[PDB]
Design a protein around this ligand. Sequence first.
Ligand code: PLP
Ligand code: PLP
Lengths: 402, 402
Amino acid sequence: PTSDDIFEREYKYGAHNYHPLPVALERGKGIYLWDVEGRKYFDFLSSYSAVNQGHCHPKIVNALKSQVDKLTLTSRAFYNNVLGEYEEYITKLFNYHKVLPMNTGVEAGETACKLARKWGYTVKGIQKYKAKIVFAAGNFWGRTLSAISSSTDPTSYDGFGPFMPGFDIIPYNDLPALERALQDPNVAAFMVEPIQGEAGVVVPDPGYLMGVRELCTRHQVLFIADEIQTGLARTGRWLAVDYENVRPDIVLLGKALSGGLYPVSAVLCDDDIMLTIKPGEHGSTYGGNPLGCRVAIAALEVLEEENLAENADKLGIILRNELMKLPSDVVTAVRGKGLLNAIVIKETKDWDAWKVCLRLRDNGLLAKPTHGDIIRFAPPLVIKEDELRESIEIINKTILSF
Amino acid sequence: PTSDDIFEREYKYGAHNYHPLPVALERGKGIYLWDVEGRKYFDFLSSYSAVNQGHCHPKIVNALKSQVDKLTLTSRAFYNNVLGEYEEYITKLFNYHKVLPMNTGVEAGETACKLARKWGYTVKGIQKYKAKIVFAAGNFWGRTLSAISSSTDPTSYDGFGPFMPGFDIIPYNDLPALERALQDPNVAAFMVEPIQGEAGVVVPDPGYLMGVRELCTRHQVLFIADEIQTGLARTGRWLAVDYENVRPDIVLLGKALSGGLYPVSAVLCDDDIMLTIKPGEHGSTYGGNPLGCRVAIAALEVLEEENLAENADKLGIILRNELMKLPSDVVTAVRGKGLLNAIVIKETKDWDAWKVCLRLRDNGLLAKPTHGDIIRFAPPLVIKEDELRESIEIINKTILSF
Ligand SMILES: *Cc1ncc(COP(=O)(O)O)c(C*)c1O
Ligand SMILES: *Cc1ncc(COP(=O)(O)O)c(C*)c1O
């Protein structure tokens, strides 16, 4: 049971929709991952912030093992005793009226889009099927037909049939462009990420979120914040928009909502926006199952009273201050918030970001390159200062070996 | 901790996107479900065939508990040792070249649509973004924007913005309509359910699947079979199309693929169709995680060598033969295949399907009405003959009380 057998066998019996890093992880706990040959690695991807609480956090595992013996799925055609308990906990946590439970991040964005359109027709008064939704250039909220229709990345939409109408694209971190776009009364909502992660951790200028809220409120437009990756204590707060005291109309949550043990996502908004969807007009089979709700309550509790937001904030400050000491001729820029950071590599034909992640894997650290010149660093929020500094020493050892 | 508290609290802190049956289930094992007050019920919905192996089947629970202690999610940016093992098992089981793992049923249909479009452009030679996909009237493959765009049910698409172009709708169980529709060379695929479940378990005439295959092959069109609900031993075979020896180009699986313990879905097709999606052109965060793959292997093994397909076939024969003994003036029709069946109620202002399911719940049986006059019966495939006959006696006792 070796690694290259795993590589070739997945290549033979699995779809070629991914080009992952050559490493076959078998075990994982906290901030560490072990492959099949026993080698230990620092996890600096966190499954795209899906295991912020670390791999197999014990409290989440205990909640999953406790609920699997009782009940797993009844479908939303009946009631169960756990779904509402998770609903009240997350609604009082983020201080919104209601929450709509889905499974994956795509479904949370699809739910937000249908909520915005239904709201624009029944509340805003838009002529039916003429409403439009604005997206920031370089956004990523999944890979459905609707999701790739609002993407500016050719690798996501090229060759996938016609595209979703009613999707407008404005540049990211651009108040004048949003102000020009919101002049159309048919615009129902503007969906944006507080920090564009999949584009290379692109942090907007300070005051951008406050301006987006002011523009959406002034022009009667729903502010949709995709916090599926940025939210849940990674950037340093419960939501990344909390850094500017901004309350979006609709908030999206995912990934870290379960600590990597279950596909759980949530859509939070107030009554006048949520109640636009009548009974039987939206839902999902696994959406809101008791098992996923138990592990979501456990993940949110171990996010709150294990102190991981300020932990990620201070360790991210240390991480960025340490990365900026590398010379400016090999590291073009260092950006990020909390434990969600990235660096830019002066890519040439001598090296690129992929070869760095290969050599980082050889030295015991797993990272993800997003464009051949950008490398992301996002360790689980349970990491400590000594472990972080040892990881950065692996980063410096790898970079200074070229 | 009573039931009406659960009802009102979900109504206060949860979205009103469902109108479920008033019963708060807390426990579940095999074919039985217990509510919070301790009352026992027969499960005749099976979470829309998601728990075909029964609630909390022990082998699936053991596989979940074994894998949760080792590894849960690494993201497809790296390899893991379990994903490929599940891929080889399911590909050799259904005898296809490759499988693409997603989480929910919507994602499996979205993957099939993008595969068909990419295939139509790179293989069939359709001018880019001019391809079309045909759907049968009354279909249901989820509730995303693309899914509701091909639906003829107003409760699914009304008020949800503009709609997906390139979606054509033909009547279900109609060979001439499919033959007329496939005359357009821009048609890339035809997605259909072998048995339309969400529409009221509409069974097509014998030979319909053979004619669909003959028409799709003759006109160079991809046959997509949505077996997410009909597949996995419920209708009596691994796939419902196996009743007519039909091999679709693309097969969709979901729900019962995990026994209700995890959102796992699969898209099975050959190489010349699957390899059209290059690395980095599709995927999902939780798609193909090790935990979901372990519970999928367990669910498929307890579906195979626990003998549930022929079990559902014979018990479905007994179920239909027993239901057809009710008088024709209260039960209009009785249709179905395997343990997926439904009856038609001569609805008046004296009664409807909802009041029947309420009285059935009062007598210890949980069923789901789909149109106010159609009632579905789908118990888990682990049910036995004596338990089935006791359940039908509850059905007759309830019907004959009006
Ligand atoms: C903002 C945002 N939304 C969705 C996703 C992808 O989630 P799934 O893979 O569909 O569960 C990402 C990661 C994201 O950043
Ligand atoms: C054929 C088919 N496809 C999808 C679904 C819904 O699945 P999810 O709720 O998205 O997991 C159904 C049930 C179906 O019959």
